[PDB]
Ligand binder design. Structure first.
Ligand SMILES: CCCCCCCCCCCCCCCCCC(=O)OC[C@H](COP(=O)([O-])OCC(O)COP(=O)([O-])OC[C@@H](COC(=O)CCCCCCCCCCCCCCCCC)OC(=O)CCCCCCCCCCCCCCCCC)OC(=O)CCCCCCCCCCCCCCCCC
Ligand SMILES: CCCCCCCCCCCCCCCCCC(=O)OC[C@H](COP(=O)([O-])OCC[N+](C)(C)C)OC(=O)CCCCCCCCCCCCCCCCC
Ligand SMILES: CCCCCCCCCCCCCCCCCC(=O)OC[C@H](COP(=O)([O-])OCC[N+](C)(C)C)OC(=O)CCCCCCCCCCCCCCCCC
Ligand SMILES: CCCCCCCCCCCCCCCCCC(=O)OC[C@H](COP(=O)(O)OCCN)OC(=O)CCCCCCCCCCCCCCCCC
Ligand SMILES: CCCCCCCCCCCCCCCCCC(=O)OC[C@H](COP(=O)(O)OCCN)OC(=O)CCCCCCCCCCCCCCCCC
Ligand SMILES: CCCCCCCCCCCCCCCCCC(=O)OC[C@H](COP(=O)(O)OCCN)OC(=O)CCCCCCCCCCCCCCCCC
Ligand SMILES: CCCCCCCCCCCCCCCCCC(=O)OC[C@H](COP(=O)(O)OCCN)OC(=O)CCCCCCCCCCCCCCCCC
Ligand SMILES: CCCCCCCCCCC1=C(C)C(=O)C(OC)=C(OC)C1=O
Lengths: 80, 313, 97, 96, 114, 70, 105, 98, 347, 167
């Protein structure tokens, strides 16, 4: 497991680099703390119009204005 | 007014191709401990004009060609595709600002093998057809790593837009996060243009039936392709500073980088022996393609794991 | 429209230069089949189809289904690599390696 | 470096998209009055053309439903000149 | 089938917002802040009715509230806004990031005077 | 010596400098002293055609500011 | 033998691309989204034999959205009568159908 | 229906009658088969772009990829036929009459 | 062929047919057919001789043509319906093109001309796959689109397949062409009952697959591809002559055997729908099939043809061939008629 | 004339198909199918399919027809063709003449004779190409489609290596 790796690194370093880069491509997004922020930035990007809701009378979490406190915020993206 | 812009693209292409031959002969002279052409013009500057006039009045070779039509169409296609590779190039502004300019260039460069194939079949010589089939197999082999390297790089760009690739490289050159892609890209563009050490059309181990005129047309299409792929490599990995109120800063900067990269092609042909044909097939299929697939996986997964996915627009 | 004009101009200039080069010097009086090349062309075609699958990735990274997208992107590049590894080990990449 | 600059470019993209979002109600109101203007002009010219034709109902819907249907390109620009037609149907595709 | 019912040419007359898209993009964030309510009334009506003919009056309120937005810029801060949308208007993609100091002067003058 | 290659390199560099400088000056001449509008997306085209309609001279680049409202 | 493995296992292998009124990327509607939604909600569960006769109105509206044959035939009739009246000289086009009115916004 | 669909269907039927009337070469048959595929690509693409049916935009690519893989298989069969008789003539492929 | 590669390729044949059977989208139907054809081409070129390359080329051309016609039918359905659900088609032109495409994939007459050639060109195991497993995917597509299948077209194809498959097998001495024309006639019987009751279509398909797999397994077990080599079987393995006798009498539909079960039920479903002339003429035309089956039973079991001297060497060696499921298939192809009401499990 | 540009490109498309389907030689047939692929790409580009048209150039013309012309050059090196070509050309221009003089025709389906600009949509898609987003959704929504296509391509590699070996 150690002589084999040195043998293939001496003979075929292109393939050793290929399997190492591919293995780091596979396993490292599951170990990265910033993989969550990729999803958050993609869902925080407003391609569509934010179609407003009819105020039935009881929606305390939905704002009446963009500059109201309630609603989803992007302070994490300005700060990071 | 747009036709003036088309002419100020395509006529300076032909002039820069004409003087690239002088630059090549002079640089290959002074790297071989001698001088290049310095007799015809002042500092040899009239050598391409004299050589063009010599080739235009040289006797036709008179081939008994298998097809007249493809014998005419192969230089027409080669020159047309060589000129259309320049129209989406952002320097800083392109002639045609298209959203998929990278993919346009990849498609129009994939079409250029038909000039090789039609010129090889339109010749009577079976050995000219064998050399054409070898050249086509070489070119379609290195198109694979062209496509995959370019895809891996544009995972940092966000789009296929060539003008966005200037925005992508405002803080750093893209050769810093992607130098292995850059070096396999550069050798693959070297093998695309049938350029040494990949010039097996000049080694004894496809367009010989053309006259001096159409040989000059294939030759100037090839040097247009060389300057173009160096400009595209410059835009792709060595993106310059762009001030929108002074665009000439970008034009001077990318022009200097593209000239140095074309001179690097000239340095490479004056420094190494040729590959044997199986050896550059080995270089593609067994060296560049596994690393290119590994780096394509890495450049897919890396903007997701670093939270560095570029914008779409 | 500007693109059609530009393509017509490049085609017209190329046809004009070819017509000059075939008719300006007229003023003066004066194979066995190789299985190996076919196999490398077919290997190009199959990997080129696999590339055509890989081409929407810069747009596919913009999705909100990133775990699935990353899984399928790595799976397509992996199947291209398995195609290359099968081509390697069954002596398909030989004498033009 | 690409991490910092792509995160900045995503924030800049969100700012561009929210400028678009803040402008969309004005553009939607203008687009609605634009298409209703063009349909009313086509309806009046259909009324002053299709008089000799027997059994012609001017403004007759081809749909059985009375729901609003988004107007087709030939419904809006059918009676107009070829320059306006070519602009409105191939201008974005042919733009550069 | 039935006759389609179109509103008349008099019912579609409104005082237009005859400014360019760079003017609109320069004023866009303060327009989305200040003209929130009739815009969201119109877009709620537009996604619920699914018919532009049922949304005309609300749309006119949009075209009434935008103009009152611009007059209140024209009365107080016409010159920093003009200097800002001209710099927006130079760019081909109309970038916000090329124009941050003119934006800062416009936001300063708007936060002070309005 | 080695600087003998520099005249041909300079001529080739001027020939590569011409197309970008030419298209930049032609865009600023044809687009009112400004950059050519980039419309890669249909919203950008919509805004550009709206500018062409609000200019009153059938040119998208003729910009109308606060002077065009009352 | 339509072995309905997708409903049996609860997996969605291909239902997502099947209709235009399904969930699209970025909520992009098809041009005939309302007509297809009406025809699907009409014909749901009643079987194909009853759906041929009982949902004919929604299906004809949806086919006419998809191919616009009645719309193009009506535009053909209007444009042909207009060309006949121009040739006879009994009609003139207005300035807003010639390009002399400087459009709305 | 719209006027371009007539020509794309007529292109399909022309390449269909080309593929259903062989002359001599198997390669010409494979070219007519891929012309049929090209016309199917164009017709699918024009429908899907006209309808704004977003998810079916990936359909013609799939239609391209599979069929080009099919074409690859066809070329390989042709080559094995051409490795038997020297040509790709369809009249050499008649051993299975008895 | 590498055995691992053989397993992966056979699983891919199975996967293509299974994708056809489980998918709700027309593109995945078309993909299942493409995957199935691509994977089954090496099974036909398993032995690498010019007859297999000719058979694979003819198979490729017919199945590729049918695949393009299938995709055109799918695309016309998308025009006139805006959707991709595997259900009834929404245009009679698309219905005609898809019925033609599926008839070409089945090799139903007058698109039958590839089936004896391709079956003769390939080994017995791959012709077993071609005549049994490759019918399963197009019959399942015909099953789901039967509200739009034109009656006159499918019945014309059915009677034309039954008559042409009956007359075609009369002239044959090669066993693979006999099984191919027998296949053409049995597929005509399956499509004739399809619009009336597709459960009887499934019954005829299953009984046909059992009997055809039995006959191919007997031919593989005795290494016989001709009538005259099958006539040596009595002097080598006398039980095999009894098995080919009972299986060929069953394929002729003679009661009390199991192959009487489909056609009887098919007539039972065609007379309820007041079609009397058509199952009558179909049953009388199937006597042609029974005639060449009886020819094979005369040459193999009911008489003793002359053998050769070298047969005495083969008396000293037992059959080491894996005759997989051959007693089970022989019992199911002959003794199943007392369990005829089991067909309701196919509903 | 310019409002009929997709129709004119479709006429050139059918003319190219009559060109190669009359089968003069597989090399001229390859050339005719190349010209047809280019003009069909132009049709697709004029309905707004930029990526699909560039796939016709990159994959169909630059990938597959390259391999067709390659195999044809390795394998190869009339009156029926010319009569078939003029037959298909006269059938196509009789179709053109009928659908232009009548603004309606019926070969098998009914076809309008107006310019095919009339059927288009009158809105915008915002900051995306809808066709690009639907192709991008192959990785998010098209998981099973990716699986069956990639498995068929791997099997295609294996199948070509099986049948071309001869052993
Ligand atoms: C439901 C549908 C089932 C369809 C059939 C599935 C199995 C057969 C297909 C695959 C195959 O060939 O497998 C080998 C196959 C034998 O086929 P073969 O080589 O032709 O047989 C020759 C000798 O049997 C081989 O002899 P041997 O000396 O080599 O070894 C003796 C062997 C040793 O057995 C074992 O080793 C078995 C123990 C291990 C099993 C796995 C453990 C893990 O004994 C047997 O296998 C006895 C024969 C078993 C019966 C075969 C047919 C099965 C019934 C089919 C359905 C009948 C329905 C009739 C309906 C009529 C009305 C419509 O099966 C087995 O070995 C095991 C059979 C188990 C049957 C279970 C039934 C219930 C399942 C629930
Ligand atoms: C774009 C701007 C310019 C870019 C650079 C270009 C300028 C330099 C040009 C030099 C002259 C070249 C002339 C042509 C030469 C052609 C031959 C050639 O180069 O062959 C390539 C050679 C070929 O190898 P070879 O054939 O020489 O060696 C023998 C190979 N075997 C064993 C198979 C027989 O090397 C490569 O293919 C390597 C390509 C680049 C690899 C980059 C790897 C980056 C690091 C990865 C990680 C490594 C660490 C381990 C894992 C760590 C994980 C954290
Ligand atoms: C070998 C199989 C490799 C891929 C396995 C699935 C990978 C994945 O991310 O799937 C999730 C994806 C998508 O799941 P999801 O969680 O994104 O779905 C949520 C719904 N949408 C798409 C609207 C966001 O696929 C599925 O769950 C179903 C399709 C594939 C099912 C498995 C098929 C395996 C067949 C093997 C033979
Ligand atoms: C043997 C024959 C002769 C051979 C020599 C000459 C021909 C070979 C060299 C020329 C090749 C021509 C290629 C034409 C199409 C190229 C693809 C293309 O147009 O891509 C650019 C662009 C896509 O980008 P995008 O930004 O999305 O579009 C604008 C939207 N804002 O799209 C656009 O900008 C769209 C613009 C409108 C549509 C343009 C259509 C052009 C005409 C059709 C092709 C004509 C040539 C056909 C045959 C070529 C050879 C195969
Ligand atoms: C799990 C991650 C994802 C993996 C899949 C994606 C890979 C991306 C790169 C694409 C590679 C595709 C092609 C691979 C072909 C492998 C087979 C091969 O090359 O075998 C032959 C070779 C000996 O070479 P030879 O046949 O002689 O060729 C002439 C040159 N001497 O034999 C060899 O040289 C032996 C090669 C195999 C051993 C290499 C070990 C490298 C280990 C790196 C560190 C660990 C990385 C983590 C992953 C585990 C890898 C085992
Ligand atoms: C609603 C219905 C849904 C679907 C239901 C199920 C349908 C089943 C369809 C059955 C088709 C089976 C085709 C044969 C198996 C596939 C692989 C194959 O052919 O393996 C045979 C194998 C090959 O041996 P090989 O080495 O290639 O021979 C050359 C000489 N040495 O080895 C041999 O040749 C050995 C010889 C004996 C092989 C006999 C195999 C019999 C298999 C079929 C059983 C009967 C059908 C299943 C029951 C009824 C289902 C309808
Ligand atoms: C009825 C359906 C078809 C209607 C159109 C007929 C087009 C004209 C062809 C008629 C037949 C002429 C002919 O000679 O056909 C045979 C020929 C192949 O035979 P070959 O070996 O080349 O010549 C020796 C003569 N048998 O066959 C061919 O080469 C035929 C190639 C046909 C390609 C179709 C072109 C377009 C046709 C019009 C639209 C449909
Ligand atoms: C009319 C515009 C120029 C037309 C092309 C002729 C000039 C460029 C090619 C001539 C040429 C030069 C100068 C040249 O140096 C050279 O040697 C390396 C050639 O042969 C391979 C050439 O063909």
């Amino acid at each position: 497991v150690a002589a084999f790796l040195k043998n293939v690194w001496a003979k075929e370093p292109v393939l050793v680099a290929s399997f190492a880069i591919a293995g780091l491509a596979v396993i490292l997004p599951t170990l990265s703390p910033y993989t969550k922020y990729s999803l958050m930035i993609n869902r925080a990007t407003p391609y569509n119009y934010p179609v407003p809701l009819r105020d039935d009378g009881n929606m305390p979490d939905v704002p009446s204005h963009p500059q109201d406190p309630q609603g989803p915020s992007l302070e994490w993206l300005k700060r990071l | 007014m747009f036709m003036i812009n088309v002419l100020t693209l395509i006529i300076p292409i032909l002039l820069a191709v004409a003087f690239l031959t002088l630059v090549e002969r002079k640089v290959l002279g002074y790297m071989q401990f001698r001088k290049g052409p310095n007799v015809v013009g002042p500092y040899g500057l009239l050598q391409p004009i004299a050589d063009a006039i010599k080739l235009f009045i040289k006797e036709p070779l008179r081939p008994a060609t298998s097809s007249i039509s493809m014998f005419i169409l192969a230089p027409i296609l080669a020159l047309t595709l060589a000129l259309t590779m320049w129209i989406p190039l952002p320097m800083p502004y392109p002639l045609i600002n298209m959203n998929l300019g990278v993919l346009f260039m990849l498609a129009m460069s994939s079409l250029a093998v038909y000039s090789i194939l039609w010129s090889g079949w339109a010749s009577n010589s079976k050995y000219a057809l064998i050399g054409a089939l070898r050249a086509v197999a070489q070119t379609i082999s290195y198109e694979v790593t062209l496509a995959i390297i370019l895809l891996s790089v544009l995972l940092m760009n966000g789009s296929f837009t060539l003008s966005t690739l200037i925005i992508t490289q405002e803080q750093v050159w893209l050769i810093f996060p992607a130098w292995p892609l850059a070096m396999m890209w550069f050798i693959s563009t070297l093998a695309e243009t049938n350029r040494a050490p990949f010039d097996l059309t000049e080694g004894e181990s496809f367009n010989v039936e053309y006259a001096a005129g159409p040989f000059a047309l294939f030759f100037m299409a090839e040097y247009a392709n060389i300057i173009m792929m160096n400009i595209f490599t410059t835009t792709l990995f060595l993106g310059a500073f762009h001030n929108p109120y002074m665009p000439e800063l970008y034009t001077i900067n990318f022009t200097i980088k593209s000239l140095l990269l074309s001179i690097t092609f000239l340095w490479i042909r004056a420094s190494y022996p040729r590959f044997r044909y199986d050896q550059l097939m080995h270089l593609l299929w067994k060296n560049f393609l596994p690393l290119t697939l590994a780096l394509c996986m890495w450049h897919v997964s890396l903007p997701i794991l670093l939270s560095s996915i570029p914008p779409q627009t | 429209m500007n693109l059609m004009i530009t393509l017509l101009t490049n085609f017209t200039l190329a046809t004009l230069l070819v017509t000059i080069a075939f008719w300006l010097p007229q003023l003066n009086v004066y194979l066995p089949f190789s299985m190996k090349f076919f196999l490398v062309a077919i290997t190009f075609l199959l990997f080129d189809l696999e590339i055509a699958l890989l081409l929407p990735l810069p747009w596919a990274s913009q999705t909100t289904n990133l775990n699935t997208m990353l899984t399928m992107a790595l799976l397509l590049i992996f199947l291209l690599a398995v195609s290359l590894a099968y081509e390697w080990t069954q002596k398909g990449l030989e004498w033009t390696e | 470096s690409m991490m910092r600059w792509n995160r900045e470019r995503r924030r800049l993209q969100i700012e561009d998209f929210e400028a678009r979002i803040a402008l969309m109600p004005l553009l939607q109101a203008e687009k609605d009055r634009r298409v209703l203007q063009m349909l009313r002009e086509n309806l009046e010219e259909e009324a002053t053309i299709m008089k000799d034709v027997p059994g012609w109902k001017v403004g007759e819907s081809v749909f059985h439903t009375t729901r609003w249907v988004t107007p087709m390109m030939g419904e809006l620009y059918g009676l107009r000149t070829g320059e306006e037609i070519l602009s409105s149907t191939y201008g974005f595709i042919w733009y550069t | 089938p039935g006759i389609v019912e179109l509103p008349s040419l008099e019912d579609l007359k409104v005082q237009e917002v005859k400014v360019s898209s760079s003017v609109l993009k320069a004023a866009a964030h303060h327009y989305g802040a200040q003209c929130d309510k009739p815009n969201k009334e119109f877009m709620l009506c537009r996604w619920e009715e699914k018919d532009p003919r049922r949304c005309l009056e609300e749309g006119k309120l949009v075209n009434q509230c935008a103009l009152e937005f611009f007059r209140q810029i024209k009365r107080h801060c016409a010159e920093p806004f003009t200097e800002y949308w001209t710099c927006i208007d130079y760019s081909g993609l109309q970038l916000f990031r090329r124009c941050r100091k003119e934006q800062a002067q416009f936001d300063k003058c708007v936060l002070d005077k309005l | 010596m080695w600087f003998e290659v520099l005249p041909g390199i300079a001529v080739m560099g001027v020939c590569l400098f011409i197309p970008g400088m030419a298209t930049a000056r032609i865009h600023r001449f044809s687009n009112g002293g400004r950059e050519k509008r980039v419309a890669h997306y249909s919203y950008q085209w919509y805004l550009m055609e709206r500018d062409r309609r609000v200019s009153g001279v059938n040119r998208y680049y003729v910009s109308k500011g606060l002077e065009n409202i009352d | 033998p339509f072995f309905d493995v997708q409903k049996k296992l609860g997996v969605d292998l291909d239902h997502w691309m099947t209709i235009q009124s399904a969930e699209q990327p970025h909520r992009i509607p098809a041009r005939c989204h309302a007509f297809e939604k009406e025809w699907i909600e009409c014909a749901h569960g009643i079987g194909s034999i009853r759906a041929e006769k009982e949902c004919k109105i929604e299906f004809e509206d949806f086919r006419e959205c998809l191919l616009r044959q009645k719309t193009m035939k009506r535009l053909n009739a209007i444009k042909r009568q207009r060309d006949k009246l121009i040739k006879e000289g009994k009609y003139t086009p207005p300035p807003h159908h010639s390009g002399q009115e400087d459009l709305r916004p | 229906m719209s006027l371009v669909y007539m020509n794309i269907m007529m292109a399909f039927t022309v390449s269909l009658t080309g593929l259903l009337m062989y002359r001599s070469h198997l390669m010409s048959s494979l070219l007519c088969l891929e012309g049929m595929m090209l016309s199917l690509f164009i017709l699918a693409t024009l429908m899907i772009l006209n309808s704004h049916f977003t998810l079916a935009s990936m359909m013609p690519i799939i239609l391209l990829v599979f069929a080009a893989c099919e074409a690859a298989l066809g070329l390989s069969l042709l080559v094995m036929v051409s490795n038997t008789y020297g040509t790709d003539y369809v009249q050499n492929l008649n051993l299975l009459q008895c | 062929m590498n055995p691992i590669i053989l397993i992966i390729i056979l699983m891919t044949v199975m996967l293509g047919t299974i994708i056809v059977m489980i998918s709700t989208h027309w593109l995945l139907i078309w993909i299942g057919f493409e995957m199935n054809m691509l994977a089954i081409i090496p099974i036909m070129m398993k032995k690498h001789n010019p007859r297999a390359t000719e058979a694979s080329t003819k198979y490729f051309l017919t199945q590729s043509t049918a695949s393009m016609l299938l995709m055109m039918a799918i695309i016309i359905n998308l025009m006139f319906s805006g959707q991709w659900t595997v259900m009834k088609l929404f245009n009679p032109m698309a219905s005609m093109l898809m019925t033609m495409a599926l008839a070409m994939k089945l090799g139903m007459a007058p698109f039958h001309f590839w089936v004896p050639e391709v079956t003769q060109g390939i080994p017995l195991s791959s012709g077993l796959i071609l005549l049994t497993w490759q019918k399963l995917a197009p019959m399942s597509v015909l099953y789901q689109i039967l509200p739009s299948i034109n009656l006159d077209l499918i019945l014309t194809l059915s009677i034309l397949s039954i008559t042409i498959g009956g007359w075609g097998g009369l002239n044959q001495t090669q066993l693979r062409k006999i099984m191919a024309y027998s296949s053409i006639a049995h597929m005509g019987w399956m499509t004739a009952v399809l619009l009336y009751n597709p459960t009887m279509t499934l019954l005829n398909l299953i009984i046909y697959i059992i009997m055809t797999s039995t006959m191919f397994t007997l031919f593989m077990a005795n290494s016989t591809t001709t009538t005259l080599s099958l006539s040596h079987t009595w002097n080598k393995a006398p039980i095999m002559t009894i098995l080919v006798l009972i299986t060929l009498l069953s394929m002729g539909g003679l009661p009390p055997l199991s192959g009487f079960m489909p056609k009887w039920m098919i007539i039972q479903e065609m007379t309820k729908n007041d079609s009397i002339i058509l199952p009558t003429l179909m049953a009388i035309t199937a006597l042609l099939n029974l005639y060449f089956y009886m020819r094979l039973t005369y040459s193999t079991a009911l008489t003793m043809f002359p053998s050769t001297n070298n047969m005495k060497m083969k008396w000293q060696f037992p059959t080491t061939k894996r005759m997989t499921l051959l007693p089970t298939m022989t019992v199911l192809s002959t003794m199943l008629l007392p369990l005829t009401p089991i067909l309701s499990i196919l509903e | 004339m310019m409002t009929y540009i997709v129709f004119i490109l479709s006429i050139i498309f059918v003319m190219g198909f009559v060109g190669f389907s009359s089968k003069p030689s597989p090399i001229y047939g390859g050339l005719g199918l190349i010209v047809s692929g280019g003009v069909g790409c132009g049709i697709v580009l004029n309905f707004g399919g930029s990526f699909l048209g560039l796939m016709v150039f990159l994959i169909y013309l630059g990938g597959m027809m390259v391999v067709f012309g390659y195999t044809t050059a390795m394998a190869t090196e009339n009156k029926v063709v010319l009569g078939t070509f003029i037959t298909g050309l006269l059938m196509e221009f009789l179709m053109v003449y009928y659908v232009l003089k009548d603004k309606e025709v019926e070969i098998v389906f009914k076809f309008n004779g107006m310019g095919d600009w009339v059927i288009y949509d009158t809105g915008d898609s915002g900051f995306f190409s809808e066709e690009a987003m639907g192709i991008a959704a192959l990785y998010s929504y098209g998981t099973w489609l990716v699986i069956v296509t990639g498995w068929s391509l791997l099997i295609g590699v294996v199948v070509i290596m099986e049948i071309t070996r001869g052993n």
